[PDB]
Input
Amino acid sequence: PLGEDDFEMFYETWEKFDPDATQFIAYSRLSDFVDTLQEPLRIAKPNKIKLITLDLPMVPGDKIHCLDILFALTKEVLGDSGEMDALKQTMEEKFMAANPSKVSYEPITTTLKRKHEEVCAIKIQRAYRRHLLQRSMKQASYMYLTRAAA
Amino acid sequence: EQIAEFKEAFSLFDKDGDGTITTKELGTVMRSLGQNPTEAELQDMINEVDADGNGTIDFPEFLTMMARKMKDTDSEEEIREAFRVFDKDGNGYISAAELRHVMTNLGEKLTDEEVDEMIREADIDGDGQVNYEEFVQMMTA
Ligand SMILES: [Ca+2]
Ligand SMILES: [Ca+2]
Ligand SMILES: [Ca+2]
Ligand SMILES: [Ca+2]
Output
C-alpha cells in the first residue's frame, strides 16, 4: 500500500527520533525508528537481524544518513529500480549543500561489517582471556609442585 | 545447552527465510564482507557441512557445524579472518590504534593496560605493530 502520505510520514517521524534535524541517527536508536513506522514501510518489531542485513552505511561514529535509511526501506518493499539509484545520487548533492553543518562526505562502515567485527572481536577477547587463565593456573601449580618437592 | 543465539546466525545467511542456505545466499554474505569466493569454492564450503547431499543447509546441519566449532580450536584460518578485519587499511600490519579501536567495541572492556600488554607481548620485532606472524603467535598456545 505505498502512497503519497507514507513519504511525508517517514519524513515526519524523523523529527520524533531527531528533533535537532541532524540527518543522522545512532545505530542503536534506529531499531525503534523502523518499528514505529507506517504500515507498508513498517518492519516488524524483531528487526535487529534485518537492520544488520540491510548494510546501511554509517559515518563516524555510528551515524546513518537520512536517505540511506529511506531508500533502503522503500527498496525493501519495492524493487531495486535503476531510477531510484540515480534519484538518490541527485538528492545526496541537494542535501549536503543544503545542510548548514559540514562533515566529511564518506563513511567507512556498514552494519554488516560492524556485526562481523563485533563477532571477530569477541572471539579474540574470549581467547585471549582464556589463554591468560591457563598461564596463571600453570604457574601456580608448578610453583606449588616445586615448593612441595623442596 | 542453549541454541538461542545460533538462530540469529542462521537467519543472517538466509535472505528469503526458506529454512535453508544456498551457495548464492552464502556468497552474497561473504562478498558484502570483503571477500571474493570462486564459484567452486562456495560449493565445497556448502558440501563440508552438507550431511544429506541436499546441496543446501538447514538448521540441523548448521547446528552440527556450530557444535563442531564449539570447541575453541582457534584455527589459523579463523584467526586470519580476524586479522583481515582488524587490519583496517590493508597494509599488513595492525597498528596499536587499530587494535585499540577494537577494544571500544562491545565484546569485552579490555582495559587500556590489558591492551598495552597484548601489544607488548606480541610485538617481537619491536616496531609498535603486529604483523600476521606476531598476531598468530600471540593467539596460538
Ligand atoms: Ca534460503
Ligand atoms: Ca542439507
Ligand atoms: Ca593497518
Ligand atoms: Ca612488528
In short: Chain A touches chain B through 23 residues (CB under 8 Å).
